Structure 1
Amino acid sequence: DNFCVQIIGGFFTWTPDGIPTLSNITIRIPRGQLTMIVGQVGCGKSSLLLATLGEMQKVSGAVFWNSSRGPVAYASQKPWLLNATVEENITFESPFNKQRYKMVIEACSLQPDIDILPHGDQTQIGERGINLSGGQRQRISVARALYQQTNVVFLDDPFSALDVHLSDHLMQAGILELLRDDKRTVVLVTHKLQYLPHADWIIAMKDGTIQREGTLKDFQRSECQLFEHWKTLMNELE
């Protein structure tokens, strides 16, 4: 219907016969909107992202896709780079479409990086190629995720290796402009709470379960402690 992904009572385990790393997972991700998963270290965010994708073994519950999942544009927390060039990593088995490629390059601000390296936009990347900075690896992975014409985008901490300006420009030109104009489902795991005003939907996680799931106006009344805790972290969250 109006949702992209939905989980009802999902118990998922990394181990085959161990303790469930996720318990009582109940999410309703809207389609064409920005959903932000927020929480502490090791609280189930990447586990939720891979439990929707089927990469983690399910013990209980149901997973519904109303997109039969289909493709999902995924940028892992550890950036994965093929042994091909910059252009082949960003395109990633897709037609070229240079007008979109320039927009993705400017949204990730990778244009100064391809004005360096011995063969800009053609240098071999990863193993058997030139070594990149970790921020450059992160932005090439995010550029691959943003470039594709996939209805669902999964981003898992894209601002970990970047400074304030790169993360702000990638948030505005890439997430709020390039992804919104396509009416694209965006699920964005982040530790940067300053982007919470730009979120349509918020999923809060705590020790491998869904603590609270709703908008910022919902968190203003349902979870007063977590709302005020967020306000203390980033110094009325409208």
Structure 2
Amino acid sequence: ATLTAKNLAKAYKGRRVVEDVSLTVNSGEIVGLLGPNGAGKTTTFYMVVGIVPRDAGNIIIDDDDISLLPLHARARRGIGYLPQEASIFRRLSVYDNLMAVLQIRDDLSAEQREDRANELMEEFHIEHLRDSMGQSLSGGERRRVEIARALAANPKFILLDEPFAGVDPISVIDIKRIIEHLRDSGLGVLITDHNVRETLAVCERAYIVSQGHLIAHGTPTEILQDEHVKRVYLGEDFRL
């Protein structure tokens, strides 16, 4: 499949926080939306996922324009989303968190739902936390349950808003291998980050945003031909 956002634009109280941001993620790809803080990354995600409405632009998946469809409708069309902050249910166990979203899987019965729940706990290495409350999980364990909870909805595209935020240096390399696994499974992965040097390497293509505008895009090799981006990458310039 193909998820495409074309020239999105969003404004809050007269201030246009996102002028013109465009991106495209295909199945079997890891596309990045990189840029400094306050550039418009999260606002772009809310427009693609459908949390906040769009002022201008289009959100298209394959031959369907889903720009005026609410969140739940785009969720049933293949879009999965994970926030930057903690989105786990802290008062429920890991098993109860996965069975939560599996309750919307009408394509499965009560037996297959609990089957996939065990399949998702072995895949993300959280079998030893089946009955553990979400509050007792560390930063890295919380994310892997949060990601597996999104995968339980069986999406076509998974959108991670800075997934490496608030996790130990051993969990980032753990989530990075989880991302490369989802890509090989046919999903389209879309991640955001402010660290451009560390995240650009795993991106087949990336879209560099700055103050609501798109300053560069393409594969990392094509992006790192923009002199302004090379300076921030090599360390010659401070602000991107």
Instruction: Tell me which interval the TM-score lies in, with the shorter structure as reference length.
Output: 0.7 to 0.9
Residue 208, structure 1, aligned to residue 216, structure 2: no
| Conserved 8 A contact 1:10-1:23 | yes
Secondary structure of the 2:101 match is coil
Partner of 1:171: 176
Of 72, 87, 100 in structure 1, the residue corresponding to residue 95 of structure 2 is: 87
> Equivalent residue of 1:160, what SS?
coil
Post-superposition offset of 1:171: 0.4
Counterpart Cα distance in 2 of 1:64 and 1:73: 15
1:91 to 1:228, Cα distance in 2 relative to 1, 3 A: farther
Alignment equivalent of 1:72, drawn from 79, 83, 93: 79
Does the aligned pair in 2 maintain the 1:11–1:25 contact within 8 Å? yes
CA contact (8 A) 1:6 1:29 kept: no
User: Post-superposition shift, 1:132?
Assistant: 4.1
Q: CA deviation at 1:159?
A: 1.1
Which residue number corresponds to residue 201 of structure 2? 197
* Structure 1 residues 64 and 88, CA gap change in structure 2 (3 angstroms): same
1:20 is paired with a residue whose SS is strand
Name the SS for the 1:154 alignment partner: strand
Task: Tell me the distance in 1 between the aligned counterparts of 2:94 and 2:217.
Answer: 38
Alignment partner of 1:184 is 2:204? no
Q: CA deviation at 1:34?
A: 0.6
**Equivalent residue number for residue 235 of structure 2:** 232
Q: Is the 8 A contact 1:91 1:148 kept in 2?
A: no
- Alignment-mate amino acid for residue 8 of structure 2: G
1:101 CA drift (Å): 2.6
Per-residue deviation at 1:163? 1.8
Letter of the structure 2 residue corresponding to residue 10 of structure 1: L
Amino acid aligned to 2:217: E
Amino acid at match of 2:147: V
The equivalent of 2:222 in structure 1 is: 218
Cα gap change, 1:136 to 1:101, in 2 (>3 Å): closer
AA in 1 matched with 2:20: N
Task: Give the counterpart of 1:103 among 123, 130, 138.
Answer: 123
Deviations 1:31-81 (A, max 9, x none): 331111111111111111111122223222222222743242211111212
Q: Which structure shows the bigger proportion of residues in helix conformation?
A: 2
One-letter amino acid of the structure 2 residue matched with residue 160 of structure 1: A
Contact 1:44 1:208 (C-alpha < 8 Å) held by counterparts: yes
CA RMSD of superposed structures (Å):
2.4
8 Å Cα contact 2:37-2:194 kept in structure 1: no
TM-score computed with the length of structure 1 as normaliser: 0.78
Deviation at 1:139, TM superposition (A): 3.5
The equivalent residue for 1:58 is 54
The reply on whether 1:121 has 2:130 as its aligned counterpart is yes
Deviating beyond 6 angstroms after TM superposition, the runs of 4 or more aligned structure 1 residues are: none
**Is it true that 1:21 corresponds to 2:14 in the alignment?**
no
SS in 2 for 1:141: helix
Q: Is the CA contact (8 Å cut-off) linking 1:71 and 1:150 kept in structure 2?
A: yes
Judging changes above 3 Å, is the alpha-carbon distance between structure 1 residues 189 and 85 closer, same or farther for their aligned structure 2 residues? same
Give the Cα separation in 2 of the matches to 1:86 and 1:183: 25
Q: Which runs of 5+ in 2 are unaligned?
A: 67-73, 103-112
Cα-to-partner distance string for 1:203-230 (whole Å, 9 max, x where unaligned): 1110112111211121132x12212322
